[PDB]
Structures are given as structure tokens and as C-alpha cells.
């Protein structure tokens, strides 16, 4: 087409969503560059699966999905196919045949408050593991014992979501990290997001 793909409206999001309620953006009908992503040095993590970043500028796709959220440092490893942990199982799971790229950078200067930034949450309890690209935002009281929680928190009755600490003095493994997961699909339809 002619219009450029609004990657500025997903990477530079003043506010990102919590990982349990990860935001998904649909990219379609635009020329997607790919030079400045792999050329920008702001990113701490840049790993691509199923395709190469150099061979990405000259390749067509029907749709491109930009999923963005916030986790902590030692949980960045889990944003990859075939990983396990609280984030991979209960918050954001990538399929074993994932074809895309994962991009993350430290946002401690933005997502930390000196009293502790308690706005970013993650799902701590769930009866079953999330299956790929599933989003669970329910806040149902987790009944961990026999006793039916009548919607009231207490003993063996949790709130399923836990809050990140996120204080600027935190260690690197506990500082906030903003993540962008670009997934490329090639459905049986003319393509809309190619590039260069």
C-alpha cells in the first residue's frame, strides 16, 4: 500500500498492559519496515523464531500481531516457545511452532515508583495452564480448598492476581521489562504486512 505500520504506537506506549491482560494490536494494510528494529540498540532481548530478521524486510504476510506487556527480568526467558513458569503457564504462552520475534528492554526508569509501582499485575493461580495465545483476565476467587469461597477472600481463598514490586532499587531480575511479541501469520489470503 503506502502507509507505514504504526509500530510507534506499540513500542512507545506511554503505558503498557499487565502481562495477564496483555494487549494485542492487529497490523494490516501497511508497508512494514524492519531496518530500525534490528538497528535500534535500545533492546536488551531480541530473539526471532521461525524466521530471520535480515530475511524479514523482503517477505510478505497476511497479518502481523503485536502483543505487548510488562514482566520482570528473570521472567523474560519465559517469552519463548516451550517454556514453563508462572508467566508461560498462567499469563502468556507461545506455541511450540511459534514463528515470530520477541523484543524486550529494561523499563525501570519508567515503570518503577519509589513507593513501589503496584499497577502491573500477573496471574499467580490458575486451575490449568494457558494454551497458546490465550488471555485470561478473570478475577474469580481461587478456591484452593474444599470450602466454597463465596466470592470472599480468605483462608484457601485467594485473589488470583499478584502485584509486582517494581521499585527502582530492585535487582535487575526484579526490575520491570517491557516486551513486544511480533507474530507473523500467512493465511490463505493476499498479504497486507510485508516491507522494505
Amino acid at each position: 500500500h503506502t502507509n507505514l505500520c504504526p509500530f510507534g504506537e506499540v513500542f512507545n506506549a506511554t503505558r503498557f498492559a499487565s502481562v495477564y491482560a496483555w494487549n494485542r494490536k492487529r497490523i494490516s494494510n501497511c508497508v512494514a519496515d524492519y531496518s530500525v528494529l534490528y538497528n535500534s540498540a535500545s533492546f536488551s532481548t531480541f530473539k526471532c523464531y521461525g524466521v530471520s530478521p535480515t530475511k524479514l524486510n523482503d517477505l510478505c504476510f497476511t497479518n502481523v500481531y503485536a502483543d505487548s506487556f510488562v514482566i520482570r527480568g528473570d521472567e523474560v526467558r519465559q517469552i519463548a516457545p516451550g517454556q514453563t513458569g508462572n508467566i508461560a503457564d498462567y499469563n502468556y504462552k507461545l506455541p511450540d511452532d511459534f514463528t515470530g520475534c520477541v523484543i524486550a528492554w529494561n523499563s525501570n526508569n519508567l515503570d518503577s515508583k519509589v513507593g513501589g509501582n503496584y499497577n502491573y499485575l500477573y496471574r499467580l493461580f490458575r486451575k490449568s495452564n494457558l494454551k497458546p495465545f490465550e488471555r485470561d483476565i478473570s478475577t474469580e476467587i481461587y478456591q484452593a480448598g474444599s470450602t466454597p469461597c463465596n466470592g470472599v477472600k480468605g483462608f484457601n481463598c485467594y485473589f488470583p492476581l499478584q502485584s509486582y514490586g517494581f521499585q527502582p532499587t530492585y535487582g535487575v531480575g526484579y526490575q520491570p521489562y517491557r516486551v513486544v511479541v511480533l507474530s507473523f501469520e500467512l493465511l490463505h489470503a493476499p498479504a497486507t504486512v510485508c516491507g522494505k
Epitope: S112, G115, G165, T169, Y174
Partner: antibody
Framework: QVQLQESGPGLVKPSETLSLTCTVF??????????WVWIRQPPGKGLEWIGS???????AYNPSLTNRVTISVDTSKNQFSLKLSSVTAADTAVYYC??????????????????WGQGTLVTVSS | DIQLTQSPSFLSASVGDRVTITCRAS??????LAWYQQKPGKAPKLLIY???TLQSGVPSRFSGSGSGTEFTLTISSLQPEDFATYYC?????????FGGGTKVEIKR
């Protein structure tokens, strides 16, 4: 040995704006594991926490001081300042600047003050 | 808002006596407590943090203990230079709050 040397006027007229400055010595203000705080003590009264600040900008103020408190940092001068507007006689107190230690891990024991400035008495009076 | 109640308000003990100051929190803050010593005209000086950990540079006669809601600061052998007003401070929740202070007078 980190030192704090505060300065500023000891007299502020009512409804004006209090302003104090704290200079850090024997250490940089861009500390990745400390906060820079202000604490005031009314004459003959206890201590009241005013606010805390990280060098990169973030702040946490006491909700008892409404929206008339602003802390700022000058990394190029190793200073951090305090500003309190619409002062009344209830704001007459000895104001201290201090260094608060931040936690490195979630649910880690921190948030105590060491060291302190010498204290500057500010009298709200016309 | 976590409130700290410090008992007593004043006390007068002799040199060599064993002094005990109590700080009671409105809720349970585990071991998130610190103690301070404020001599006249001086800024408060950190004595104990984490309820019982003594700060480097404090005489061993000072000691803190307690967990949950009630905490105690103990001076095993009161000295003349220990005349000050002692404050406790919770370090668990914001806003950060102090106790009312216990002014310790010397009896000679």
C-alpha cells in the same frame, strides 16, 4: 562516608512557598539503591515523613500533605530540593533531608533513614 | 495508614538501670521496624533496623526485639549520654510513619 548538607531560608511568609536544598557529599546522588527523602519535626512534636525520591524522577509523597509537596533532583549538582506551597503556621518545623535505603528484592526489609542532614528550622511568619 | 503507639511517653531511670521501651503497631508488620535515637538539637540517629539488627557503630547495650504488633527497645545499662527521645518507625507500608517518641531522662 556519605554526608548531607542542607540549606535554605529559615523564614517564609504565610501562603508563600517553602524551598530547601540538600547537597550530597562523599557519594553520588545517582544511587541505584537509595532514595532521597525529607522529614520534618514540629517544635515539641514527633517526626513526619514528607516524601521520597529516586534520582531518575519518581516520587512518593505523604497523602497528609495534599498536592503542595514537590521534590526535585539535580544530578549535575549532586542536589535534591523540597518545595512546599501555601504554607501556614502548621508548617513551622525543623526540616531534615535524609537518605533512605531501598529494597533490592520484593518484600525485603529496607526503608530506614541513614544518614540525616543537620536540620534547618523554617518559621512560617509574616 | 499504619499507626505506631509508643509507651511510655516519658521515663526517668538511673545510671546502670535496665530500660525497656514498647512500640505497638496498629497492625502486624512482621519485623519491619527500626529504632532511632534523637538527642537535643541533633538529627535522629539510627539504632536498630529489622526489629533486632543493630546498626554498625551503636553500643552493644542497645538491643531490639519483637515480631508482629509489639516491639521492645532495651538499654541493658543506662548511661548519662543516653539521654534522648527514642522513636520507632515502621518500614512496611506507605506512607512511612513514626511513633510518638519516648523521652528518657537520667536519674542521678
Amino acid at each position: 562516608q556519605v554526608q548531607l548538607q542542607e540549606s535554605g531560608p529559615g523564614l517564609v511568609k504565610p501562603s508563600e512557598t517553602l524551598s530547601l536544598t540538600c547537597t550530597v557529599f562523599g557519594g553520588s546522588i545517582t544511587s541505584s539503591n537509595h532514595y532521597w527523602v525529607w522529614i520534618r519535626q514540629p517544635p515539641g512534636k514527633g517526626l513526619e515523613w514528607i516524601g521520597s525520591m529516586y534520582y531518575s524522577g519518581s516520587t512518593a509523597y505523604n497523602p497528609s500533605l495534599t498536592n503542595r509537596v514537590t521534590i526535585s533532583v539535580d544530578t549535575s549538582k549532586n542536589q535534591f530540593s523540597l518545595k512546599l506551597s501555601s504554607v501556614t503556621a502548621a508548617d513551622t518545623a525543623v526540616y531534615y533531608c535524609a537518605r533512605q535505603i531501598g529494597p533490592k528484592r520484593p518484600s525485603q526489609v529496607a526503608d530506614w533513614f541513614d544518614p540525616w542532614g543537620q536540620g534547618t528550622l523554617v518559621t512560617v511568619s509574616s | 495508614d499504619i499507626q505506631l503507639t509508643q509507651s511510655p511517653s516519658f521515663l526517668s531511670a538511673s545510671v546502670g538501670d535496665r530500660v525497656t521501651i514498647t512500640c505497638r503497631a496498629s497492625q502486624g508488620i512482621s519485623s519491619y521496624l527500626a529504632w532511632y535515637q534523637q538527642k537535643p538539637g541533633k538529627a535522629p540517629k539510627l539504632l536498630i533496623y529489622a526489629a533486632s539488627t543493630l546498626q554498625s557503630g551503636v553500643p552493644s547495650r542497645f538491643s531490639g526485639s519483637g515480631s508482629g504488633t509489639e516491639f521492645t527497645l532495651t538499654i541493658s545499662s543506662l548511661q548519662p549520654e543516653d539521654f534522648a527521645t527514642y522513636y520507632c518507625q515502621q518500614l512496611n507500608s506507605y506512607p512511612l510513619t513514626f511513633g510518638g517518641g519516648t523521652k528518657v531522662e537520667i536519674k542521678r
